[PDB]
């Protein structure tokens, strides 16, 4: 469906375009681990350990931004489409979600440019009401998609091998080999997930880029 997510970020739109989207800290194979990401503490809304966090409302994203990015004379709130690279952190980490009141939804591998609907500018903490639309966005494509179901994330929760969650439901039924080599398999599962996800986005965007071809004329 056409639901949107929201994230305050000091990185401006030109940078986001150049970077191919909103990337996790370690990208510039990076560590991908949801439990580590969710527990991460500076100048950024959570974006370490292979994921990029968002809020489920503009109000929430703005409030988070004012906590972390006060003292930035200009920052942005990115409006982001739902798609199956996104996990509801509370649903996946369950009772072990470290900050449940934040109700975060986190994108495994970051948020590709095409998934960004647009952005608001925040000047001196004041949200400017004009939404700037992203030309890289694809509305039919992303409005046909939703976040990933929690069942696709339990196996990627990323708890350490000795963590009790791996012996409890729901995670027991999805534990990587060694969990309950655990961290090695968590990582490789994340890498596989991201590779498969990116294949779909490449297909959509790059196919559109090749829809100019006219065989007969040449």
């Amino acid at each position: 469906n056409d639901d949107k997510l929201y994230r305050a970020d000091s990185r401006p739109p030109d940078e986001i375009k150049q970077s191919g989207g909103l990337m996790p800290r370690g990208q510039s194979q990076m560590n991908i681990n949801l439990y580590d990401h969710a527990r991460g503490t500076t100048g950024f809304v959570r974006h370490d350990d292979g994921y990029v966090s968002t809020s489920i409302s503009l109000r929430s994203a703005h409030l988070v931004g004012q906590t972390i990015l006060s003292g930035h004379s200009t920052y942005y709130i990115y409006v982001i489409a739902t798609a199956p690279n996104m996990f509801n952190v509370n649903d996946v980490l369950g009772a072990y979600s470290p900050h449940p009141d934040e109700q975060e939804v986190s994108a495994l591998g970051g948020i590709p440019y095409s998934q960004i609907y647009g952005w608001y500018r925040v000047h001196f903490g004041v949200l400017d009401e004009q939404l700037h639309r992203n030309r890289g966005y694809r509305d039919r494509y992303y409005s046909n998609l939703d976040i990933a179901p929690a069942a696709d994330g339990y196996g990627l929760a990323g708890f350490p091998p000795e963590h009790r969650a791996w012996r409890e439901e729901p995670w027991i039924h999805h534990a990587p080999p060694g969990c309950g080599t655990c961290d090695e398999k968590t990582q490789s599962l994340g890498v596989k997930f991201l590779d498969e996800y990116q294949s779909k986005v490449k297909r959509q965007i790059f196919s559109g880029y090749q829809s100019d071809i006219d065989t007969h004329n040449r």
Binding site: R140, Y141, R203, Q204, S207, G208, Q210, S211, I213, D214, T215, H216
Partner: protein, 103 residues
Amino acid sequence: TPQNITDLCAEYHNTQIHTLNDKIFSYTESLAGKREMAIITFKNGATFQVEVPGSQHIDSQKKAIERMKDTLRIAYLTEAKVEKLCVWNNKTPHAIAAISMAN
């Protein structure tokens, strides 16, 4: 001049409209001699061809047959929802005359 695919379709004999409102499930193309054609299917099992160019086509259609194969290949890849196809139903599989994409 017709303003939409349904009215266009009614200008020809042995045609009908199929309403799919769905992306293409499969795309097949061939360079084998006398079978230089494309075939698409939809998840409901519906199968359609772009005909091999032949004496049944006038010269002005040759470029359009090539365009339609370009369009189907890339509609498949972009998962574009196909609204309707106008086809000739005196061929098996039904042969595509026109396509509309919407939604």
